[PDB]
C-alpha cells in the first residue's frame, strides 16, 4: 500500500536521525574548540561571526 511505502520511507529517516542523535557532535557544536580538535583550516570554509 501507499501508506506502507510511506512507512518504509519514514522508518529509513528515523534510523538516520537516531544514528545522527547518537553520533558525537561536530566540532562547531562542542562549545570550546582548539586548533587541534578541529580540522586544520576548518574555519576557512565556514562563515563565522
Amino acid at each position: 500500500s501507499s501508506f506502507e511505502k510511506q512507512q518504509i520511507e519514514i522508518r529509513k529517516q528515523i534510523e538516520q536521525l537516531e544514528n545522527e542523535a547518537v553520533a558525537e557532535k561536530k566540532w562547531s557544536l562542542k562549545g570550546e574548540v582548539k586548533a587541534k580538535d578541529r580540522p586544520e583550516d576548518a574555519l576557512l570554509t565556514e562563515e563565522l561571526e
Binding site: 586544520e40 583550516d41 576557512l44 570554509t45 562563515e47
Partner: peptide, 21 residues
C-alpha cells in the same frame, strides 16, 4: 604527497572564498 595535499586545501580555500565574493 603532503605538499600536494596542502595545495589542494589551498585550492578549496580559494574556490570557497571566490564563491563568497
Amino acid at each position: 604527497t603532503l605538499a600536494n595535499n596542502v595545495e589542494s586545501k589551498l585550492r578549496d580555500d580559494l574556490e570557497r572564498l571566490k564563491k563568497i565574493r
